[PDB]
């Protein structure tokens, strides 16, 4: 017994406030959210097949106030359907509020609200880039361990009406068949190389022909023709991904066959970028809703 309507209500209570106001849920509620969502993730496919209409969002990185701005703009659940591309924790000041609201909505609307796994939904990054420290400051290490187990079960990619492929990072040199994604067993950690690594780590690069070295020191870059071949082969129209801050919140690649979405404006007080969210209507017409940078 875990009161979802209460949790959502308390998390949403800070809606008008000055950015940075904390919501303090009880320890047992947070791990209630983890345990129930984990169940739902495991019960749904690892490669989601989704119908339009829906809103797609990129990285959020603990920017809770900005997540609330996104829902204000796109409509709070269930007014709209949502697919998030990952990277909910780290970098920002309020990872816990962000993940809890998202996990709460997943539990309440399990077939209209969706979360993919980003590279920060992984202990090897989490320990170091804010989340663990958040957990240990406001609760304890044990809670971080619980989140790790939940994250290990997140789905990895989505296809929207057979036309739009969505994952956090991008393509893999090892991605030949969609069945290869379907075969990944959960729970699972992110390996240092291979398909699951690439899907969460790779980047598009204008200046690369085929597959190249990635400056991150993990995975690869891929060029425009690679994107073209993939869409052609699998009969798709668009690749939708996140993973890199861009100045205007979204950015096209390869004559509009790939788009990068990034939803956190003023990214971690180090950039002055816009954030964007993508709207996909029933006919698969796509439009962009921008959160402009602070003035």
């Amino acid at each position: 017994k875990l009161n979802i309507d209460s949790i959502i209500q308390r998390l949403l209570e800070v809606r008008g406030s000055k950015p940075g106001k904390n919501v303090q849920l009880q320890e047992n509620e947070i791990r209630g959210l983890c345990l129930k969502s984990r169940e739902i993730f495991l019960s749904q496919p690892i490669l989601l097949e989704l119908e339009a209409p829906l809103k797609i969002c990129g990285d959020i990185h603990g920017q809770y106030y900005d997540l609330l701005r996104l829902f204000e703009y796109g409509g709070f659940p269930p007014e709209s359907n949502y697919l998030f591309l990952g990277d909910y924790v780290d970098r920002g000041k309020q990872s816990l509020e962000t993940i809890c609201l998202l996990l709460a909505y997943k539990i309440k609307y399990p077939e209209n609200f969706f979360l993919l796994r980003g590279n920060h939904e992984c202990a090897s990054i989490n320990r170091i880039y804010g989340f663990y420290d958040e957990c240990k400051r406001r609760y304890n290490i044990k809670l971080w361990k619980t989140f790790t187990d939940c994250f290990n079960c997140l789905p990895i990619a989505a296809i929207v009406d057979e036309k739009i492929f969505c994952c956090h990072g991008g393509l893999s040199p090892d991605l030949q068949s969609m069945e290869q994604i379907r075969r990944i067993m959960r729970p699972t950690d992110v390996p240092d190389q291979g398909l699951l690594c690439d899907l969460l780590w790779s980047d598009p690069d204008k200046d690369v022909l085929g597959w190249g070295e990635n400056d991150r020191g993990v995975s690869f870059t891929f060029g425009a023709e690679v994107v073209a071949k993939f869409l052609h082969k699998h009969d798709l129209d668009l690749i939708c991904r996140a993973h890199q801050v861009v100045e205007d919140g979204y950015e096209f690649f390869a004559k509009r066959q790939l788009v990068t979405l990034f939803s956190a404006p003023n990214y971690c007080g180090e950039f002055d970028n816009a954030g964007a969210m993508m709207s996909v209507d029933e006919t698969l017409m796509c439009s962009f809703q921008i959160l402009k940078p602070a003035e």
Binding site: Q44, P45, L48, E49, L50, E51, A52, L54, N81, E111, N112, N119, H120, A123, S124, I125, N126, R127, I128, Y129, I141, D161, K163, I164, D192, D215, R216, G217, V218, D237, L238, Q244, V245, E247, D248, Y250, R256, E270, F271, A276, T283, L284, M285, C286, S287, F288, I290
Partner: protein
């Protein structure tokens, strides 16, 4: 009504519009450099693991 299952994609051209230089080329280069510097997570994977290792060994 759910959207989990298990036509052509277009762009709203009016939405896209509604959303080169030696100054702008410089501004782009600065951003690309900032971004490259920021994305250093790959450098600390091993340390993160060693930290997870020894905190497990505390039990």
């Amino acid at each position: 009504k759910g959207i989990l299952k298990n036509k052509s994609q277009k762009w709203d051209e009016m939405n896209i519009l509604a959303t080169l230089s030696p100054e702008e080329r410089e501004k782009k280069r600065q951003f690309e450099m900032k971004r490259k510097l920021h994305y250093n997570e790959g450098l600390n994977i091993k340390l993160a693991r060693q930290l997870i290792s020894k905190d497990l060994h505390d039990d």
